[model samples]
Target chain A: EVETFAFQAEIAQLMSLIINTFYSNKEIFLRELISNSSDALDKIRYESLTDPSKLDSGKELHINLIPNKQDRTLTIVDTGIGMTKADLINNLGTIAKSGTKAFMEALQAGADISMIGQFGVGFYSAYLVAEKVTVITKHNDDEQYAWESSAGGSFTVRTDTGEPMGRGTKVILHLKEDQTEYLEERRIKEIVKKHSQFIGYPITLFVE
Target chain B: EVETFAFQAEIAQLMSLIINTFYSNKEIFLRELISNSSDALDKIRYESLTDPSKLDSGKELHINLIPNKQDRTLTIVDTGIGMTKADLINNLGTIAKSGTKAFMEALQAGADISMIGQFGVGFYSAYLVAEKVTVITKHNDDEQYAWESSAGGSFTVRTDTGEPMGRGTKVILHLKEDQTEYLEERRIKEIVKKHSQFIGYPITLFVE
Candidate 1:
């Protein structure tokens, strides 16, 4: 059963700031999401060193970019450490400053105010191009769950029972009308090579 | 006379997480500061492109490390776009999530959880080795001012009438009882080379 939630206007204010600052290049959204996947992968790799059992038998580490043009959906999946219900709600859903006056001045004068979300807001960069985003994750310590948001204000989180994710996260982006550029293999490969080829984990881009 | 400020207990509570994660290697403090300086320099360099006047008639950009063993102060100076009183208070001064529970679990399992303040806390790393931290900066449009914090509960900002900094920042670290190694030329060089040699700007280490 799908449950609907209404995000209040307060959160939308924060999203507006992020969207305005990052709308310059929608492609950056893909780079940031993939980078996040790589970090997630790195975390699990670091953990498995001291305790090897974190990885399942014959499990390989990699990121998969699956694009479906018909549905206008693109899913980037990572077999890294996954998020619990709270992690999903807290990390991606809700995450800041009224240095607002100066920050806007800095940007208008061409200063790099990208530091606004330098650390915390990169995930929201997804909104730069996506009309909606869905995250399904399964963590070793907790049951699988799904988190969905449209960036208007509210998001939804609930137990997930469709085939278990095993151990990782799947981020699905509902590409906006103008963002179909990101749904192309050539575009996806270019972005992956430019921003993520250096990633320690293998990032595979799939067709069809 | 230098006015002292105490950081709030609530803020300190936030900082405690950062200190614990970064205390393992205090040298990282210098690395983080220089990295910030490098970023500041890049910002100004980007700005100077559109407006050449931003750079003085003849200002060679670089970072200077002035060490005084006697007074036990190590200053990292940068010729970059500096902050105003408000900028300092807002940017370095104030600036979490828990998917936080799972993030903690990842860290407990040795998955690096440097997520707290991933954007704003690097400046506070100076307190790892300094009894007090002072930031003296001059912005192109603002007068030179000094900000001092002892990690208590609040911080103080005041005007500086001494030599004008021209246009940039000077961060002075007041060495703590057990953290004087940073005062040595050899130690400073080792840390700089090990951490910041690749920094595009000339990072000069003064010997006097």
Candidate 2:
């Protein structure tokens, strides 16, 4: 069954605020996505210590950044503890609903605020440079699902009959026309090194 | 009539996690509270631009840190846009309900996370050094109200019939037995200088 969910009013407000006012440093979107991937990898690693079955993917844990010039998309893939459908709906749909007021004020004041990891809305930073975002994820306990949104009023999630990702998540950003800088490997490498150098997992870049 | 409400399960979990594991830097509680007060002050200042009536409090826009050794409490008072009853219930009672899982992982990993303002849970940082917290506030739009909690499973809100605060919020933290360091005027001055020096409003300290 397929499901479409309207963004909560608070969430839509936050999205509009971020898209319009915040993120002068648009490259931070890559940092946010990479950090999230690292967190997922850490979770699976920690869980595997107790239940080795959690690492059933049998894949060396890492993050892959693939930029497709032809498709005008950038994909961040991670071999980590992926999300279930509930996780996607809850995590991605809400987007710091309660903190929007403070966030708006901070943005208006031009304060240097970096709260993605803390507020769990860093995922929304994807919209800073992408017109559309698609997340394909598989949790060991749940079926693979595809979540797609244009950062508009609603997002849709459906069962994926596509190629199995085995385990973990793939976030594809349909880059905006002006955000082609992110499609460059050198730019991605520089951003990853600058912001996420401390991430424990290997971050590999794929060449076209 | 007074109202007692149990914190939502997710809120209680976040509070417990913050009190127990997240804050090794206990002094950050002061910084967080001061920052919040500054934000409130900023709000009133901004609102007054559009509607001069917002500043009807007739009080200077500033934050006051009062250390009461007799009461074993540190009260942070701000002459800003204070909370109404509903604001008190929704803002203080919920505290980053959705971000708890990410917060837990960040704490466990010992990541240097500073998300108090972003997640709207900076208020709970008071529990790091205090056993109980009391918030008495007055908004021009509503009657004065007081919110009290032990950071336990529940909290209460009641009409405050005592001396009118004019307008703004007063956060009183009942210091823990071992947290007398906050009662020192010198320490508070140092912390304010270190963390909140850039705040736009005046922050006054009251001794004794």
Candidate 3:
């Protein structure tokens, strides 16, 4: 069973504002996604001290980047604390409702827009390089779920009836034609070195 | 009629986190308040281009600082676009709901908390040095209203029956005993010089 949710009106407005205003810094999308994965990894590690079962016995906490040149897609996989169905709806569907509202008001008042990154709307940066995004995640407490969006004012979430995922998330970006640079191993390596080197978790690039 | 509203649970938590964690940088409270006033002033000025009346005739845009030694109170006033009752309820009462939620989550995950400045919860910083805060504001389209709080988990809003205010906002901080430095003209001048000298409008300090 699948459920579709419309982006809040403020979110639709914020989508255009971000894509148009921050086009020059499109590479930050990878950094944002990686940072989010790191947070999830940290959460699971911390929670496991108190509730050990939250950590699956065999899965090491790390991030994996895969580029499929034939399919024109880039995928980021993380062995981290994944989201439940409610988390998908609340975190992605709402888009930090009040923060987006304040950001819109600040933009209207001509305040600096560079602070956009700090507003928690950084997830939307995915739209900068991807024509579509698909997220498959499974939490220790909940069944696997898939979230997909094209930034066309709405997104859909569904129970994953296909092959099951372990405890973590996989984000696949259907890259825009011009954003093919992200599909290059050299470019991904450079981004990791420049921005994510300090991340505590291992970030691996699939070169073969 | 006065209406009382409890701070959202996230806001209550954020208030304590900000006051206790950022105690050493309590002075930033003034900078945040002044910056918000500047934005409001900019809004009315910009709106006036499309509707002249929004810029009440005869009032020049500026900020005023009044320090009362006898009362141990410091007041900051701005002839800016003020808040209506709804604005007070939404902006102040709710405390940027989602931003506070994300900030708290990041804090729990051991992320650096210095970025708290950008989270729109800066208003709560007033509690660092102040035992109480009173805000009186009048918007061009709405009657005067007052919002007051001690950061004890709730706030109150009421129609102001006292002397009517012009189109602007006034924030009064009742300083705690240790915060009496804010009630000094010399100290306020130093703060304005250090942090707010580049503000576009004139900032005047009232002296006896």
Best by TM-score: 2
For model 2, fnat equals: 0.00
Clashes of each: 11, 0, 0
Clashing pairs in 2: none
lDDT per residue, candidate 3, B80-187, as tens digits? 888878778765422366557656665666654444544555677777788899999999878899999888788899999897868899999999999988877788
CAPRI quality band, candidate 3: incorrect
- What is the C-alpha DockQ of each candidate? 0.03, 0.04, 0.03
What value of lDDT does candidate 3 attain over all alpha carbons? 0.76
Tens digits of per-residue lDDT for model 2, B5-110: 9887877886787677744678889888987887677557655654687777754888999999989999999998898787787654333453455455555655
Is 1 or 2 the stronger prediction by TM-score? 2
**Candidate 2 CAPRI category:** incorrect
Q: If scored against the real structure, what TM-score would every candidate get?
A: 0.51, 0.55, 0.53
Relative to the true interface, what fraction of contacts does candidate 1 keep? 0.00
Off by over 4 Å in 3: A1-208, B57-59, B93-95, B109-114
Q: lDDT for every model?
A: 0.70, 0.79, 0.76
Model 3 agreement with the true structure over A161-183: per-residue lDDT tens digits:
88776888889999999899999
User: What is chain B's TM-score across the candidates, in the order shown?
Assistant: 0.83, 0.92, 0.91
